[PDB]
Amino acid sequence: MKLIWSEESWDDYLYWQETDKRIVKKINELIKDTRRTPFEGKGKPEPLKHNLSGFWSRRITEEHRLVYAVTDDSLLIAACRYHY
Amino acid sequence: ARKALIEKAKRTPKFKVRAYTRCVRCGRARSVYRFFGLCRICLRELAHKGQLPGVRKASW
Amino acid sequence: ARIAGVEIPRNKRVDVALTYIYGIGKARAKEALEKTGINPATRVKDLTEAEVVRLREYVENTWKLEGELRAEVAANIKRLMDIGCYRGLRHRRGLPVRGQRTRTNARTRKGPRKTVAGKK
């Protein structure tokens, strides 16, 4: 299972790296659980449709979400910042 | 975690098998001897210094 | 002579003949022979029919043997499984139960070497 970061997802991961430290471990915790079970685990692993068919989200916090998508041996993270 | 463990090793209670002998000079848990209470390294350091009564360089 | 369901040892010592039955080893064989009163040196090629029927009556009125003993072992293994026991699930995968080493040799239980490629 190899990680795939897109353009905006990596910049937002660096955005949490520069400002607050406590969320960055929580993010990596969420990546760890979707690595061992891709669709289940922590923080309500939720599907999306009605432009996002085949994409799944979890909540990092109460407003921002950690969306993702899965393929055979890869883990794509599209964003780790605010939904919309 | 070094110093709290050495003084966990000093206290006796709560199911005696939980007591493990430990060196008092350095605080090693392994290769510690019942004849001295020193580890295997503190043994050599003091025995070469001569602070061990009767201990000599064995040779046969 | 056919005792437990098997005949197979023809001229050989009788204690050896009873060790050749699933369910009777060396100790149960000598127990049956010190019961019956047969010198084990008297072979199975030369023994009285009365000794044979007394020996058969004893060894298959006393303990449980070949078909039923296997049924009991299989029933106990089936009871160990289907209940969620640790030893039952080790029997289920086909792994050893008695706390052994599986990073290395456990091949009597595991089978033949199933060599898998191994990147690096």
Partner: protein, 83 residues
Amino acid sequence: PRSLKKGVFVDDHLLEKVLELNAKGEKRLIKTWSRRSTIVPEMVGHTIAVYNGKQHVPVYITENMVGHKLGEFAPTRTYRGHG
């Protein structure tokens, strides 16, 4: 295993819980950490939870699981194959 001369089933916690529970009734869920404990027949019929190292997995007890321990029914590892 154990010796037979001395009192088998070493634990008191879930025992002092279940001896209230079997005579009062009403089949409740009990969490314990005692994996070293023998399933003694007043425990038959109950749903108790055992810690595995991570969480509390519930087990259901019926009359054939008796001469065992609770750690026999709480799997610690996860294998799921090889790939």
